[PDB]
C-alpha cells in the first residue's frame, strides 16, 4: 500500500499539461508537427510567468491533480500494522479522535504496560 | 438429601467438539493480526498483573520443612 501511494502521488498528485493541436474535424497534425509545438511549450524551458500567444486552434488543457485521500490510506495502514504488532497507534505518528484523553487513554496505555 | 446428584446433566454418547475444532482455535490464535491481538489483550487484562497467595492463620502453620521454619504461604 505504501508503494501504491508513492506511485499514485507521482502520476496523480501533480497537474500535467495537455496541449491539443488542430481544429476538431480540421486538418490532421502528425508527430513531426507536434515536435515543434513541444519545443514551444516544453516544461523544462518554461518559467512561472511565461505567456502564450496562439491562433484559435491550439488548446492548452490541464490534467488536474486528481483527489485521493492518501492520508486516510496511510492512517488505515498504520492502524493495521500498529494493532498487529501490539503497539499503540501513537507509536506510528498517527493520531485518533476521542482516544487521546480520559479513561480511553488510561485503558490503552495500561494494556501496553 | 442425597450423596449423588439426582438431576441429570444433558450429555452422554453424543449424536461436544473434535480435535479439528481444537485446531481451529489454534489457527485463529497463531494467525496473528487484529483478532489475535485483541484476545491477547483480554488475557493480559484478566491475568497480566500476576498474583498473591494468602493463607488464613498462616502464622499458626509454622513448621520445620527441612531444618528451617516455614509457613504454608512460604512453602
At A67, list the grid cell: 483527489
Chain Cα centroid distance, residue B10 = 24
- Contact yes or no for B45 and A111 at CB 8 A: yes
Q: Could you give the angle at which helices B33-47 and A102-112 cross, rounded to 10 degrees?
A: 90
What method did the depositors use to determine the structure? Answer: cryo-EM
Q: Does B58 touch chain A (CB under 8 A)?
A: no
- Contact yes or no for B37 and A83 at CB 8 A: yes
Provide long-range contacts, Cβ within 8 A and 24+ apart, for A62-66.
A62/A15, A62/A16, A62/A17, A62/A18, A63/A15, A63/A16, A63/A17, A63/A18, A64/A15, A65/A12, A65/A13, A65/A14, A65/A15, A66/A12
**Cα gap B41→B44, rounded to integer Å:** 5
Amino acid at each position: 500500500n505504501e508503494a501504491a501511494i508513492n506511485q499514485a502521488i507521482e502520476l496523480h498528485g501533480f497537474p500535467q499539461r495537455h496541449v491539443k493541436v488542430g481544429k476538431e474535424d480540421g486538418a490532421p497534425v502528425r508527430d513531426n508537427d507536434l515536435r515543434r509545438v513541444r519545443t514551444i511549450f516544453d516544461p523544462r524551458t518554461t518559467d512561472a510567468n511565461t505567456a502564450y500567444f496562439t491562433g484559435q486552434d491550439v488548446d492548452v488543457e490541464t490534467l488536474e491533480a486528481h483527489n485521493f485521500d492518501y492520508s486516510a490510506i496511510h492512517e488505515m495502514d498504520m492502524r493495521n500494522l500498529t494493532t498487529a504488532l501490539g503497539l499503540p497507534l501513537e507509536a506510528g505518528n498517527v493520531g485518533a479522535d476521542g482516544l487521546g484523553s480520559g479513561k480511553p487513554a488510561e485503558l490503552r496505555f495500561a494494556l501496553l504496560k | 438429601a442425597s450423596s449423588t446428584p439426582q438431576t441429570n446433566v444433558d450429555s452422554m454418547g453424543g449424536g461436544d467438539l473434535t480435535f479439528e475444532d481444537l485446531r481451529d482455535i489454534k489457527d485463529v490464535r497463531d494467525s496473528g493480526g487484529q483478532v489475535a491481538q485483541l484476545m491477547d489483550y483480554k488475557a493480559l487484562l484478566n491475568f497480566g498483573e500476576g498474583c498473591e497467595i494468602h493463607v488464613e492463620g498462616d502464622d499458626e502453620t509454622k513448621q520445620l520443612v527441612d531444618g528451617e521454619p516455614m509457613t504454608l504461604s512460604e512453602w
